[PDB]
Design a protein around this motif. Structure first.
Motif, PDB file in Angstrom:
ATOM      1  N   UNK A  33       1.124  -1.286   0.156  1.00 15.41           N
ATOM      2  CA  UNK A  33       0.003   0.053  -0.081  1.00 15.41           C
ATOM      3  C   UNK A  33       1.019   1.187   0.043  1.00 15.41           C
ATOM      4  N   UNK A  36       3.059   1.604  -3.164  1.00 13.92           N
ATOM      5  CA  UNK A  36       2.154   2.297  -4.237  1.00 13.92           C
ATOM      6  C   UNK A  36       1.830   3.764  -3.896  1.00 13.92           C
ATOM      7  N   UNK A  38       3.810   5.692  -2.552  1.00 17.66           N
ATOM      8  CA  UNK A  38       5.107   6.317  -2.818  1.00 17.66           C
ATOM      9  C   UNK A  38       5.359   7.212  -1.384  1.00 17.66           C
ATOM     10  N   UNK A  83      10.257  -6.492  -3.927  1.00  8.48           N
ATOM     11  CA  UNK A  83       9.937  -5.497  -4.854  1.00  8.48           C
ATOM     12  C   UNK A  83      11.216  -4.864  -5.273  1.00  8.48           C
ATOM     13  N   UNK A  85      11.676  -4.310  -8.104  1.00  7.09           N
ATOM     14  CA  UNK A  85      11.199  -3.338  -9.348  1.00  7.09           C
ATOM     15  C   UNK A  85      11.567  -1.775  -8.948  1.00  7.09           C
ATOM     16  N   UNK A  86      10.734  -1.352  -7.929  1.00  6.92           N
ATOM     17  CA  UNK A  86      10.682  -0.002  -7.438  1.00  6.92           C
ATOM     18  C   UNK A  86      11.808   0.127  -6.473  1.00  6.92           C
ATOM     19  N   UNK A  89      13.911   4.555  -6.753  1.00  2.00           N
ATOM     20  CA  UNK A  89      13.205   6.138  -6.227  1.00  2.00           C
ATOM     21  C   UNK A  89      13.406   6.321  -4.887  1.00  2.00           C
TER      22      UNK A  89
END
Lengths: 266, 567
Positions: A33, A36, A38, A83, A85-86, A89
């Motif tokens: 949560x 997603x 950020x 993750x 993936x992200x 950032x």
């Protein structure tokens, strides 16, 4: 350290396996949560921590700072292992038993603390640091100590730029920041012990915990008691010039002028 | 074929540039070139309907013998139309599939570019224009008609055993002399089980406007690679199975591959500035994939919106949670793809082909092209038809609509591009003014059952949608939302209606309608269906358009019309 062997294992044993309320505990979904969202502010309740292991109350406050770092690292090692993936950032929260103003004391420094206050007029927002880079004057090769370093010196003539550079240079670049805004404290006129000294004390927050406060308004904090880094140390007057500083971990509303009813609906 | 007839093409002519389309200007602007190639001066025409047809040629009444037919023919036995046709040749390269054989046969000034899988209309002219009943094309007991007339010997001619023709059954008597009518209606009508099943069931279209013209000119040692890009405009206009059924989509992945995987004027020196030789690429036909952020797409995509219900928020919760598997940023997910950081836009597409596997939208990726002019740019193959139709602007100055048809023909030049971006000023804002009543619709539930279909009507105009074709889109935008997602198949799949308020043009209730989802090849009875209420009653109806799926009523002669239209 040795005991941290057990802690990480004990964390990872609950953040995605220990469950109440008929399955799918939030932590297994809270991470994603916020991911997603950020947002990066994973929250905990000490109640459920206590439900897992009540041993989590007394090897903690020998240093409550290690508890939060040891939790932040479980976070990182849970985020990108699942993750990655992200990954191009974290901090956490806790939010449940009250203590009172003027009850924190000499003895309540730097431990498990849960504490309250109110806002008034204060300053703006500004940035701080984390990392050590200074060198380039002789050879100035890339050396790269292996940490972002808060208050750390070695200062050799030997350091890998041809083990040189006893003299010194400084960088103004490649330099981490973190915003920050100062507070002013206040205490409630409801809970008055009859006109005692008016509460205002050095208390602190940080980058994410920022840009939300408003004067004469309230917010309950977790909070933990410390002191200014150096309160007027020299052979000097008939008192030290000491204040004492508190710093914010989770900020939890006391006002709620908006919708007030969480999970009345009847 | 005109490898021989093109040899004829020298004397005067008219190249009318056929009725409103993309494909026309694609397949014609090419030909303003070829005519100055063979030293031919020309003249070309705007068509909007049969109105334009003779209102102008009545001004151009010569005997100009070389004449076009594209995007037309299903109108008249066009000698009946152009009675001044004596020997003035016409030329057939039309895409309108359902045409009358009266213009095929009587083949005086027409040319059949004929090859097809339909051997079902063979003597259809030999009876339909040949038979009748209660008929006078005959002799009589009177001494005035005892002479050789146009004795058609048919259902036109006598029923008293005076008729050379009609060898179909006995003429002395079957059981009587007058059974001729009986068999005439049998033979007339028993095939109209198929004939009137033609031209009174639905309508659809054929093929390209300049693919032949490429191949016609392929023989001419012409590697006008630019013209291929002019070509594909007409291809993806209606080869796109997202709009119009092709099938050959997946079979010209061989052909134009067999064109351009073959055709290489430069195997050695092709990497330079002006119009580098083209590529085929497996890409999307997604809603303007390239030039603006993802968050334009992820709402504005029907293929997303059909499966995910993105007007609301659960889509977005579903959206980002699927961007978990990519882990895209968000600031970057709200700036232009071309503007984003670089390894992302570069790497991006590669994973979406595979990690759209599990999330109900696997068929966003198709096959396409891409090319340029220079180094300001990289225009995109699919990213071109949509800016065009912003210049198809329904302004009522009385000057724009004809003239802006000319600007389109000035558009597809390499020299003329400042104008072109003006479409993008216009296009996207339309595409999100799309929702501007939709969420007001799906929650108002303005879908009307209305019996054996689904039904909608709007009652308040858009300056945007005075212009007609978006009426089909909004129709094509929504029934997915509520009608296809909150339901079962029994209670979901039925076609639809889509009304157009003319709040400015005095009130005439314009409309279009379309088939249900996953029923595409079921061609639309709307090719005729709206004749249902009109054929029975009809009230001030128009079919003035060349298009089949198109109409015009009065303000208030639509409901009892619709009541007749129940069936």
């Amino acid at each position: 350290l040795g005991p941290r062997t057990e802690i990480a294992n004990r964390f990872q044993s609950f953040l995605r396996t220990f469950v109440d309320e008929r399955g799918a505990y939030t932590y297994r979904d809270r991470i994603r949560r916020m991911c997603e969202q950020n947002m990066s502010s994973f929250v905990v309740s000490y109640t459920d921590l206590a439900n897992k292991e009540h041993v989590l109350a007394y090897f903690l406050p020998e240093a409550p700072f290690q508890m939060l770092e040891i939790f932040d690292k479980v976070a990182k090692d849970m985020v990108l292992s699942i993750f990655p993936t992200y990954e191009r950032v974290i901090h956490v929260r806790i939010s449940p038993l009250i203590e009172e103003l003027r009850t924190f004391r000499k003895l309540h420094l730097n431990q498990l603390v849960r504490t309250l206050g109110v806002v008034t007029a204060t300053t703006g927002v500004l940035p701080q640091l984390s990392v050590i880079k200074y060198d380039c004057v002789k050879c100035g090769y890339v050396l790269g100590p292996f940490v972002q370093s808060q208050n750390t010196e070695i200062k050799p003539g030997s350091c890998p730029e041809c083990q040189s550079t006893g003299p010194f240079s400084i960088n103004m670049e490649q330099t981490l920041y973190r915003n920050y805004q100062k507070i002013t404290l206040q205490e409630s006129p409801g809970r008055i012990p009859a006109g005692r000294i008016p509460r205002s004390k050095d208390v602190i927050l940080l980058a994410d915990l920022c840009d939300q406060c408003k004067p004469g308004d309230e917010l309950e904090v977790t909070g933990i008691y410390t002191n200014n880094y150096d309160g007027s140390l020299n052979t000097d007057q008939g008192f030290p010039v000491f204040a004492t500083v508190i710093i914010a971990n989770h900020v939890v509303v006391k006002d709620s002028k908006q919708v007030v009813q969480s999970l009345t609906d009847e | 074929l005109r490898n021989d007839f093109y040899r004829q093409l020298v004397g005067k002519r008219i190249l009318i540039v056929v009725n409103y389309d993309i494909d026309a200007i694609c397949a014609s602007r090419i030909l303003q070139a070829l005519f100055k190639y063979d030293h031919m001066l020309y003249t070309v025409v705007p068509i909007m309907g049969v109105t334009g047809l003779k209102r102008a040629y009545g001004e151009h009444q010569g005997d100009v013998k070389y004449v076009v037919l594209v995007n037309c023919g299903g109108c008249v036995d066009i000698v009946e139309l152009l009675q001044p046709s004596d020997d003035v040749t016409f030329f057939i390269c039309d895409s309108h599939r359902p045409l009358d054989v009266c213009n095929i046969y009587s083949d005086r000034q027409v040319c059949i570019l004929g090859d097809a899988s339909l051997e079902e209309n063979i003597p259809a002219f030999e009876t339909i224009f040949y038979d009748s009943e209660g008929e006078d094309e005959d002799e009589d007991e009177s001494s005035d008609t005892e002479q050789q007339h146009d004795d058609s010997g048919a259902g036109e001619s006598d029923q008293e055993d005076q008729a050379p023709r009609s060898r179909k059954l006995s003429r002395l008597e079957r059981h009587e002399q007058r059974i001729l009518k009986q068999r005439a209606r049998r033979q007339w009508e028993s095939e109209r089980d198929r004939i009137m099943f033609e031209y009174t069931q639905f309508s659809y279209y054929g093929r390209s406007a300049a693919l032949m013209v490429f191949e016609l000119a392929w023989k001419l040692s012409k590697d006008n690679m630019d013209l291929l890009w002019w070509a594909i405009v007409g291809i993806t206009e209606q080869l796109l199975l997202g709009k119009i059924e092709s099938g050959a989509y997946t079979l010209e992945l061989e052909q134009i591959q067999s064109h351009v995987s073959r055709l290489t004027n430069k195997t050695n020196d092709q990497n330079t500035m002006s119009a580098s030789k083209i590529t085929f690429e497996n890409d999307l036909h997604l809603v303007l994939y390239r030039h603006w952020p993802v968050t334009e797409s992820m709402r504005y995509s029907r293929y997303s919106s059909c499966q995910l219900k993105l007007w609301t928020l659960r889509g977005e919760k579903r959206l980002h949670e699927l961007l978990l598997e990519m882990g895209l940023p968000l600031v970057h997910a709200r700036q232009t793809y071309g503007a984003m950081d670089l390894v992302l836009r570069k790497e991006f597409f590669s994973m979406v082909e595979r990690l759209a596997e599990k999330y109900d939208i696997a068929d966003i990726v198709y096959g396409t092209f891409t090319l340029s002019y220079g180094y300001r740019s990289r225009y995109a193959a699919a990213d071109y038809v949509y800016a065009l139709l912003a210049i198809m602007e329904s302004v009522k100055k009385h000057k724009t609509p004809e003239d802006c048809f000319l600007e389109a023909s000035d558009a597809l030049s390499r020299q003329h591009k400042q104008l072109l971006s003006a479409g993008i000023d216009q296009a996207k804002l339309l595409h999100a003014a799309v929702f501007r009543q939709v969420q007001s619709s799906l929650e108002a539930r303005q879908v009307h059952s209305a019996g054996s279909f689904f039904y909608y009507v709007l009652q308040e105009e858009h300056a945007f949608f005075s212009y007609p074709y978006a009426l089909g889109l909004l129709a094509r935008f929504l029934l997915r939302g509520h009608v296809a997602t909150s339901r079962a198949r029994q209670a979901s799949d039925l076609p639809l209606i889509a009304s157009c308020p003319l709040n400015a043009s005095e009130g005439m209730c314009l409309l279009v309608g379309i088939v249900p989802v996953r029923e595409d090849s079921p061609r639309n009875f709307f090719g005729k269906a709206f004749e249902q209420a009109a054929q029975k009653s009809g009230v001030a109806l128009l079919q003035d358009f060349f298009e089949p799926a198109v109409v015009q009523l009065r303000q208030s002669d639509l409901t009892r019309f619709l009541d007749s239209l129940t069936v």
